[PDB]
Design a protein around this nucleic acid. Structure first.
Ligand code: MG
Ligand code: MG
Ligand code: MG
Ligand code: MG
Ligand code: MG
Ligand code: MG
Ligand code: MG
Ligand code: MG
Ligand code: MG
Ligand code: MG
Ligand code: MG
Ligand code: ZN
Lengths: 165, 36, 142, 206
RNA sequence: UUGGCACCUCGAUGUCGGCUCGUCGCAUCCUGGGGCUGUAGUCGGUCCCAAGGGUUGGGCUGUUCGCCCAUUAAAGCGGCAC
RNA sequence: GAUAAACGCUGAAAGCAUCUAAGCGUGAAGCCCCCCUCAAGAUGAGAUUUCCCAUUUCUUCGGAAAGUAAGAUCCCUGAAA
């Protein structure tokens, strides 16, 4: 784990606080797994070698990496609305999709995550917390998920939908 | 979902996994979804 | 003949405060049931009550090994048809921890009038604070 | 969330502006006085204690006279608490007039139902009679006490017993008219109780 | 269920159906949630979760059962000395 | 509010993948609240407000007896019971 420039990390028990330009993260890890802060490089240390630890050991480097990468450059999950009359409007902060329902469906962007729409037929969830970016995009997709017959619905960017008659 | 005692790959895209201590096969072909 | 028998009030009942933080629900309970029944005193008389008072603090931090937090079910029947209610040990540790330890310990006391007296000597607290400072309770280790 | 105590005077009917004819209970609520404010610090919950109609001195005792004294009021026939209300509104010894309610306001009337005395299962539990003819000797009887296996009768086997005189809450009664000079509410429909019954009118929980 | 056995009861455990009153199980009839579908849509099918509530008036048959008329969201299957 | 089945996100063990092992989310007429009623014999007998006061006699301290206080009842007129 190589900390990019401008980024800072602190360890006050078993939790790590990764504060950078784009945001500020906190995450409580497993005490058993020991983390080492250096000037520009982080190293996660495994104590024993059981099925319990080996798993945690990996999860930590990955989440810690996902906390650092997330505050540096950030994360974008880009969604497409395919289908006639399926458009997306952002009228303030609330995302607003017309997606075939008799009512429109609106999404208030969670704290730290930022929705925006270049075109009416694509949505981009932006944030730092890859977890939170993941759970907003999922929820937006889950409004009208891709149906297999025509391909209508909200899909992720490079997603394979199965097709039928 | 086929829920049955005998959970086996039906094609070669079928994969056998475990979730919550249940054996299951997942597959591109949704007819092949099985849970034990 | 000559075997000593404790008389009521004869033996000095002491107040003990036991921190439950991270001890198995049983394991805590079996030790306390012994202290209440007065089995740790040579003056132990099976028909009297020579045992001590016990204050348990931090019962919200009592330990449940394995999946007991979700899988240990506590049942109550009202005695109306279909009147069986259930609570998980985890839900009960969060909301009524006082009740969790009381149930646990009430099962390890004798099932008689004396056992019902013993249970009155038990004082369980979710948090770290009690209002029994006036009884000058002594810390006890398991 | 407002409240007030009154006596059920009786029922009648009124013509709406529309022209429709609705049935109404008349509730006379003169002499409501705030007697006590209960707080989370002192009692453990928020409530306001309201005393209703004035009672002759000889019908009160020193404990009563000493409790109303605090509100500088004569003793009261009925004293009830109202929870779920703003204690900032209400001062000790203040009048509670029926003007706390407007027209169109939606209330919940609480009171004790009329006493029927010892009743049987046909009237008390709405059970079916047995046949009256075809040789039947089974008319107004409660039916099997239950199966054989338990060697006992389950709880809630409904049987004859004293029937009315229970606290009942009718919910979502519209107030139709409010007359301050006569201290009267007209509530649409009927409320529990005999004429002269104490009725507790609070803003509808729903 | 049809049976097998003969262990309690022959100084009596005295009766099928209906009526009255229910209560319980879930192997779910309806209503709720979901997976698959020979899921375009509609109307369906099937499996998983689910027992909160609901689950009918007649004609014929002593009839349980059944058949029929007319309804219903549905007219569930069992246990409780059938 | 927490869940079932289920759908996911993040995610290693197992450089990939993976709803799962750590960790988040969504999700039933069901579960717990919410709504109605009973409810401190809840002997674990709870709380608040108000009232009465610390009398007399003998008694080994223990306690006993007697008139009372606030208050309740008997009795009487009754019903909305
Ligand atoms: Mg009457
Ligand atoms: Mg009838
Ligand atoms: Mg007759
Ligand atoms: Mg029995
Ligand atoms: Mg033989
Ligand atoms: Mg005999
Ligand atoms: Mg089932
Ligand atoms: Mg017939
Ligand atoms: Mg029978
Ligand atoms: Mg993944
Ligand atoms: Mg939820
Ligand atoms: Zn397959």
């Amino acid at each position: 784990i190589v900390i990019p420039a401008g980024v800072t990390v602190t360890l006050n028990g078993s939790t790590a606080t990764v504060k950078g330009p784009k945001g500020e993260l906190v995450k409580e890890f497993n005490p058993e797994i020991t983390i080492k802060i250096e000037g520009n490089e982080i190293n996660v240390s495994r104590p024993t070698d059981n099925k319990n630890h080996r798993a945690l050991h990996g999860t930590t480097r990955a989440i810690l990496n996902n906390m650092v990468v997330g505050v540096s450059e950030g994360y974008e999950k880009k969604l497409e609305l395919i289908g006639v009359g399926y458009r997306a409007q952002k009228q303030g902060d609330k995302l607003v999709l017309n997606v075939g329902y008799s009512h429109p469906v609106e999404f208030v962007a969670p704290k730290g995550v930022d929705i925006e729409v270049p075109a009416n037929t694509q949505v981009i969830v932006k944030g730092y917390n890859k977890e939170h970016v993941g759970e907003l995009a999922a929820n937006i997709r889950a409004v009208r998920p891709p149906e297999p017959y025509k391909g209508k619905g909200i899909r992720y960017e490079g997603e394979h939908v199965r097709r039928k008659e | 979902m086929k829920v049955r005692p005998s959970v086996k790959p039906m094609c070669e895209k079928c994969k056998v996994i475990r979730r919550k201590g249940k054996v299951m096969v997942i597959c591109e072909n949704p007819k092949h979804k099985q849970k034990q | 003949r000559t075997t000593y028998m404790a008389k009521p009030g004869e033996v000095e009942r002491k107040w003990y405060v036991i921190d439950a933080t991270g001890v198995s629900l049983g394991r805590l309970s079996s030790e306390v049931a012994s202290i209440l029944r007065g089995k740790n005193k040579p003056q132990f008389t099976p028909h009297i009550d020579t045992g001590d008072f016990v204050i348990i603090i931090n019962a919200g931090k009592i330990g449940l090994t394995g999946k007991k937090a979700t899988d240990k079910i506590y049942y109550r029947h009202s005695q109306y048809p279909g009147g069986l209610k259930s609570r998980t040990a985890g839900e009960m540790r969060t909301n009524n921890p006082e009740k969790l330890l009381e149930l646990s310990i009430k099962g390890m006391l004798p099932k008689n009038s004396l056992g019902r007296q013993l249970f009155k000597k038990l004082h369980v607290y979710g948090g770290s604070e009690h209002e029994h400072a006036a009884q000058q309770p002594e810390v006890y280790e398991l | 969330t407002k409240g007030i105590l009154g006596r059920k005077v009786g029922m009648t009917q009124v013509f709406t502006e529309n022209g429709e004819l609705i049935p109404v209970t008349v509730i006379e609520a003169a002499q409501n006085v705030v007697l006590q404010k209960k707080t989370v610090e002192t009692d453990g919950y928020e409530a306001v204690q309201i005393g209703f109609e004035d009672k002759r001195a000889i019908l009160s005792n020193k404990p009563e006279q000493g409790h109303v004294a605090k509100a500088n009021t004569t003793p009261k026939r009925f004293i009830r608490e109202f929870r779920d209300v703003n204690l900032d509104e209400y001062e000790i010894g203040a009048e509670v007039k029926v003007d706390v309610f407007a027209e169109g306001d939606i209330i919940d009337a609480t009171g004790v139902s009329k006493g029927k005395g010892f009743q049987g299962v046909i009237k008390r539990h709405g059970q079916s009679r047995g046949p009256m003819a075809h040789g039947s000797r089974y008319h107004r009887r409660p039916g099997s006490m239950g199966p054989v296996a338990p060697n006992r009768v389950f709880k809630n086997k409904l049987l004859p017993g004293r029937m009315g005189g229970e606290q009942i809450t009718i919910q979502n009664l519209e107030i139709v008219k409010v007359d301050v000079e006569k201290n009267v509410l007209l509530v649409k429909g009927n409320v529990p109780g005999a004429k002269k019954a104490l009725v507790q009118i609070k803003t509808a929980t729903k």
